[PDB]
C-alpha cells in the first residue's frame, strides 16, 4: 500500500489500459504520493511535461515546504513556472538559479531547459544553440524516466533550433526522433508543429498533412487545437490561398497579423492597413516585430520596411522566416550580392 523503481511503469500501464482517464487517474495518483520519493520527483516532471499545471503547482509547493533532492526539484521547477508566467524576469530567474547552487544532474539539466523555453517563447533565439550544448543527459544516472523525458524535450528543442537555423532536413530528423522517443501528447504536438513549419516554404501538401495530424491528436485540447489552426492559417497565407483558418474574433498579434496578410494577398489593402493600424499599438518581441515590418513592406511596397524586417529577424536570429522579406526584396529587383551580404553578416 509502494512505488515502482521507474515512473514509466505506472504511466505505460495507465496509457495502455485506461487511456481516456489518464488525467483523472494520474492526478489522483500523483497528488497522493509522498513528496520525498523519486516517484513524486518523477511525477513532477510528468506533470510539467504534460502541462498539468494544477498537479505540478501543488507538487512544487509541497516539495519546497517539507528532503534535499525534492526541495531542489521543487525550487527550480517553480522558477520555470514563474518565468513562463512573467512573474520574474530572465535576470531574476538566472540570479535565483545561481543562488540555488544546484547539485543534481537532473536540475542542472532543467535549469538550462527552462531558459531555452523562455528564449523560444520570447523570440530570442541567438542564445539557444550554445546553451543546449551544455546539457549532458548521460550524467543523469538515477532517474531514467527523467533522463528519457528530458531526452524528448531536447529533441524537440533541437528541432526548433535547426528550424531557426534554416537546417530543415535536420529539423525534421530531430522531431522524428522526438516522436519515436515519446508517448506524451505535448511533445507529439510540438513535433508535428515543427515538422509542418519546416515544410512551409516548399511542400504545401506535406506541411498541411503534418498540421492536420496535429489537429487529430489535439481534438480535446483547445490550446493545442488553436495552435494547429494558427499553423494552417499561416501556411495558407504563405501560399496566398483562400484561408479558411483566419480568426477574425481575436486581438492577439498572431491572429491579427494573419488577418492583414490575407487582406494583402487578396487585394484589400484598406482593410489590411486597419489591422496594421491596430498592431502598431502592441508590444512586439523582436521576432513578432520582424513579421510586422514584413507586412507593412508588402502593404506599402516600401523596401525600407523589408530592411527593418530583416534587421529584427537578424536580431532574433531567425534564419527561416527572414526568407519572406528576402523574397520580396528579390521581386523588387534588389542586387543579389546585397542579399548575399545581408545573409552573411550577423547581429551582435
Amino acid at each position: 500500500d509502494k512505488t515502482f523503481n521507474e515512473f514509466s511503469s505506472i504511466v505505460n500501464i495507465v496509457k495502455s489500459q485506461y487511456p481516456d482517464r489518464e488525467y483523472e487517474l494520474m492526478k489522483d495518483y500523483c497528488l497522493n504520493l509522498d513528496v520525498k520519493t523519486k516517484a513524486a520527483r518523477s511525477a513532477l516532471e510528468y506533470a510539467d511535461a504534460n502541462m498539468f499545471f494544477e498537479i505540478e503547482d501543488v507538487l512544487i509547493d509541497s516539495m519546497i515546504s517539507c528532503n534535499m533532492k525534492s526541495k531542489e526539484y521543487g525550487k527550480v521547477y517553480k522558477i520555470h513556472r514563474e518565468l513562463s508566467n512573467s512573474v520574474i524576469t530572465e535576470f531574476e530567474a538566472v540570479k535565483r538559479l545561481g543562488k540555488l547552487n544546484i547539485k543534481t544532474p537532473e536540475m542542472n539539466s532543467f535549469s538550462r531547459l527552462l531558459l531555452l523555453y523562455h528564449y523560444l517563447s520570447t523570440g530570442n533565439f541567438s542564445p539557444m544553440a550554445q546553451l543546449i550544448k551544455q546539457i549532458d543527459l548521460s550524467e543523469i544516472s538515477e532517474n531514467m524516466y527523467i533522463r528519457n523525458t528530458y531526452q524528448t524535450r531536447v529533441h524537440v528543442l533541437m528541432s526548433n533550433i535547426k528550424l531557426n537555423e534554416n537546417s530543415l532536413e535536420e529539423c525534421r530528423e530531430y522531431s522524428k526522433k522526438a516522436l519515436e522517443s515519446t508517448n506524451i501528447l505535448r511533445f507529439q504536438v510540438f513535433s508535428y508543429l515543427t515538422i509542418g513549419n519546416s515544410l512551409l516554404f516548399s511542400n504545401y501538401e506535406l506541411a498541411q498533412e503534418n498540421f492536420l495530424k496535429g489537429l487529430s491528436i489535439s481534438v480535446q485540447n483547445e490550446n493545442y487545437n488553436m495552435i494547429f489552426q494558427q499553423a494552417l492559417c499561416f501556411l495558407n497565407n504563405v501560399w496566398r490561398k483562400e484561408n479558411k483558418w483566419i480568426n477574425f474574433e481575436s486581438d492577439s498579434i498572431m491572429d491579427l497579423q494573419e488577418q492583414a496578410h490575407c487582406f494583402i494577398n487578396f487585394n484589400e489593402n484598406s482593410k489590411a492597413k486597419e489591422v496594421l493600424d491596430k498592431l502598431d499599438l502592441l508590444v512586439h518581441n523582436d521576432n513578432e516585430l520582424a513579421m510586422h515590418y514584413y507586412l507593412k513592406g508588402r502593404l506599402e511596397q516600401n523596401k525600407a520596411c523589408f530592411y527593418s524586417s530583416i534587421e529584427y529577424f537578424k536580431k532574433s536570429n531567425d534564419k527561416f522566416l527572414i526568407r519572406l522579406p528576402l523574397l520580396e526584396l528579390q521581386k523588387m529587383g534588389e542586387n543579389q550580392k546585397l542579399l548575399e551580404l545581408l545573409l552573411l553578416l550577423e547581429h551582435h
Binding site: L120, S159, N160, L193, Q230, A231, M254, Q257, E258
Partner: peptide, 6 residues
C-alpha cells in the same frame, strides 16, 4: 505569425 513551441 507562425506558431512555435516545444
Amino acid at each position: 505569425g507562425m506558431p512555435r513551441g516545444a
